[PDB]
Structure formats: structure tokens, C-alpha cells
Ligand binder design. Structure first.
Ligand SMILES: Cc1cccc(C)c1OCC(=O)N[C@@H](Cc1ccccc1)[C@@H](O)C[C@H](Cc1ccccc1)NC(=O)[C@H](C(C)C)N1CCCNC1=O
Lengths: 99, 99
């Protein structure tokens, strides 16, 4: 679909079998989700954005469906204020900016 | 134009007589630019990122040219590591997400 930006581009996602609301974020290199339980091994990582750094758990090769489009890639889980879908997954669903 | 998301969507902007590189960020409600000396009145503001908040100066009705597309609105200025073009200005240049 074509999504205007008068409101936050929030969409429903499905990960680990659970439905969530997440932000399509072209300003994010990575995908970071709020604290949750995901199966599989993880590695402790840290990312620094505006405001400082946070500790996250990196899950690789995680299935995630974004607005009906499937993706498999790296998902970070930690104390992020909002579920963020980053460019690593936005590219997989064929997302582009257009004006 | 159409901008893929394989790399950071960075584009050239013109503000206050200066040319700069800025990030088209659908995950940013507002626009925040690296520290610069804009004239006129301003109001303090704090904006939240992934790691916390930073203090910025809010300037209203500031003209910015984004890829040749003009826009006028609120521009925040503060210790941001990256120039960020937010939804308040992306809407003005007719920017959409498409997949
Ligand atoms: C939310 C908001 C409100 C008002 C004004 C502004 C500018 C606002 O946006 C501020 C903001 O940080 N939004 C982020 C997502 C957001 C929305 C709401 C709350 C919190 C965050 C995201 O889109 C932009 C921001 C840019 C950035 C900053 C420093 C270093 C690198 C990149 N990108 C990142 O932080 C990403 C994270 C998300 C994986 N990130 C950090 C690891 C390095 N690379 C990278 O890409």
C-alpha cells in the first residue's frame, strides 16, 4: 500500500505467533522490538541512538510478517519505547520512499 | 524521486542559506538538525530517542528545501548526531511509504 505520513506509520506485525503494532522507520538501520520472549539463541548487543545507548538481545533469522509481507532477518529486543521496523526488514518487503 | 532503503535515505537539504545532508526519517515526528545558529526566536523542547531525551531549540516557520522540494514548518536544533527530516516536513514534500 501507499502510506502517507500525517500520522505515525504504525502497522500490525506478527512475530513469534503474536500480533503487535510497530513503526515503519526509514531512519532506523535495525529492527528493535519491546521486551518479549522469542525462541532461539541470542547475543547481547548495544545500540546507540538519540538519548544514549540501550542493551538489546539480538535474534538472527527470525520470521516476522509485516502488513501481510513476510520477512526473515535480525530482530533486536530490548527496552525500546516503540516497536520499530528498520531498514533491514523494510528492504525485504520491498518498501521505498517516494515523492 | 524513488528512494530505496538499502542504505540510509540521506539527501541534500538547504536551510538558512546552508547545504546539508539529512536523513528522511518516517520514524521521527519532528525535524531535528545538528547544532547551528539560526536567527529569530525559539522555544526550548525535549525530544525522545531510543536511549533517552536531548534538549533542542524549536524554531517555527523555517523554510527547508528537500531535493528541490520546498517546505516550511517547525525545525528543531540540538546536539543530534544526524540531521533528521521528520514527518512534519515529509508530508509537505508529498513523501509516502510504498510496498
Ligand atoms: C520520535 C521523534 C519525535 C520527535 C522528533 C524526532 C527527531 C523523533 O525521532 C527521534 C528518533 O531517534 N527516532 C528513531 C526511532 C524512534 C522513535 C521513537 C522513539 C525512539 C526511537 C529513528 O527514527 C531515528 C534514529 C536516528 C539515529 C540517531 C542516532 C544514531 C543513529 C541513528 N535511529 C535510531 O535510533 C536507530 C534505532 C531505532 C535502531 N539506530 C540506532 C543504532 C544506530 N543506527 C540506527 O539506525
Amino acid at each position: 500500500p501507499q502510506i502517507t505520513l500525517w500520522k505515525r506509520p504504525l502497522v500490525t506485525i506478527k512475530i513469534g505467533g503474536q500480533l503487535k503494532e510497530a513503526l515503519l522507520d526509514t531512519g532506523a538501520d535495525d529492527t528493535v522490538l519491546e521486551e518479549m520472549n522469542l525462541p532461539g539463541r541470542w547475543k547481547p548487543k548495544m545500540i546507540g541512538g538519540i538519548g544514549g545507548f540501550i542493551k538489546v538481545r539480538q535474534y538472527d533469522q527470525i520470521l516476522i510478517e509485516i502488513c501481510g509481507h513476510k520477512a526473515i532477518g535480525t530482530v533486536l529486543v530490548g527496552p525500546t519505547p516503540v516497536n520499530i521496523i528498520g531498514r533491514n526488514l523494510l528492504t525485504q518487503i520491498g518498501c521505498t520512499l517516494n515523492f
